[PDB]
Each structure stands twice: as C-alpha cells, then as structure tokens.
Design a binder for this molecule. Structure first.
Ligand SMILES: [Cl-]
Lengths: 135, 135
C-alpha cells in the first residue's frame, strides 16, 4: 500500500448489489457516508503515509486535498482542517480494518445501505472490512 | 422476479472486492461454490417458477438445464437429476433470502471467499443475503 488517490468501499454491498464507496459530503464537519460506486470525485481520496512503520495514514478528499478525515462527535468520520488526524489501515485476511491510530475502534456500516453514515466503534464481521483500490 | 436466466451472487464481496457468484462445478452431486463474477456459463442459472403462492422455484445450471439444485448431505447445495427440488426466494429489504421450500434454513457463506462452498443452515447477517440479476 502506497501514497496516491484511492476509492475505499465496504465488503458488504447494498441490498441491490452496489459497491458502497466512501463519499465526501462536499464540506467539513459533516458525517462521511457511503454511496454507490460511480466514479465521482467525491469518492476519490488522497492517502498520505504518516508513519509507514505504524501503518498510519491521513485521508483527504481530492476536492479539498489539505483537509483530513477525523473522528467526529457521534462516532462518525468527518472532514476537518489538518491536524495530523490519522487512521491505521491494516490488511487482514478479510480485507482492510480501518482503525484509529491507537487501534481501539473500527469503521463499519450498520446496514450497508446507500447514504449510510460510516460508524466508528466495534469491529463487525463483514461490514467492518474494506477494499481500497488505486485511482 | 420471473422465469429466465440469472446470476446469483452474495451481498458480501471477497476480501479483494469481487462479487461472489453461484457457480456450477460441472458435475452432479458436487458442492456448489461461489467464485468471482466472470460471465462464465457456470454462473448462469435457469429459474423456473414451481409454486407462485409459496414463492418456490427450481434452479438449474444452463450447462445441464434439466438438472436441479437440491439440499446435499453436509448441508451444501448439489446438482441432481430432477425431482421437484425447490427453493423459496424471498426478497427482503436486505436482499434475497434463499431458503428451502419449508423455510427452515438459508443459504449463506461463512467467510465469503472465492471457491467457498455454499452453506445451508442458519440465516446470517449479510452473507445470508443474495442478489439475483437477469441474464
Ligand atoms: Cl451428494
């Protein structure tokens, strides 16, 4: 895994079979959601290596490339002005487990539906795992 | 849902993000598996309505169209010579729940990996739900 632009989508598809991709809501301090994979810029993220030895990274929307995803009140990711907000990206045999820098919580989807806000908390079979693809 | 040819794939993707489609192994009395969606004829199934009131169907591989999927020993589906083997196809708000005619068991995947045999038993969040798409 290396720096560049990526899509990030859940292992669990929508009820209609759509890949549910991390989607920038177009402004800061607004819960980041998933939506059907569609090639829009809101679904492209810049990963920058923070500590390679820690597998930690910053994640920035291409639309606002200096901004970073942080841990929002309500336990949802939100985009913010930069301040070393990082996530651990661990490749497991079930896909990526996206955790905070201290590896105490995980991103998941509760229902895996279009428009759903990403949850930060307990790890979850299947919906706690993600796919990260270049470009 | 109507008679015709379909792909049938899990709501849960492989760890690499591949849609896992029901795949005929090319002979009878051999556990039916899932594999990455690839347009092969082994992934095309003929659905015929058995009883509309009870929502039951026969499922036959296009490769051996008179044959039917039945409930195999070891609780895995297998293909067999026809003898009214049916499955209930219920569209829930989380996708299709594929059960036996009596609605006591469900098809799911334990790990949702390429090559995995389909399990017949407990309903399972996410991996007990399916997507059924024409042709
Ligand atoms: Cl058998």
């Amino acid at each position: 895994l290396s720096a560049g632009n990526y899509i990030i989508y859940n292992r669990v598809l929508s009820p209609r079979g759509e890949k549910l991709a991390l989607t920038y809501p177009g402004r800061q301090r607004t819960p980041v959601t998933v939506s059907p994979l569609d090639g829009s810029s809101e679904q492209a993220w810049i990963l920058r290596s923070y500590d390679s030895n820690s597998n930690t990274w910053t994640i920035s929307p291409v639309g606002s490339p200096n901004s970073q995803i942080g841990w929002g009140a309500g336990n949802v990711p939100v985009v913010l002005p930069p301040n070393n907000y990082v996530w651990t990206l661990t490749l497991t045999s079930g896909g990526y487990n996206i955790q905070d820098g201290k590896r105490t919580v995980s991103w998941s989807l509760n229902n895996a539906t279009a428009g759903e806000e990403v949850s930060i908390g307990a790890d979850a079979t299947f919906s706690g795992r993600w796919v990260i693809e270049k470009v």
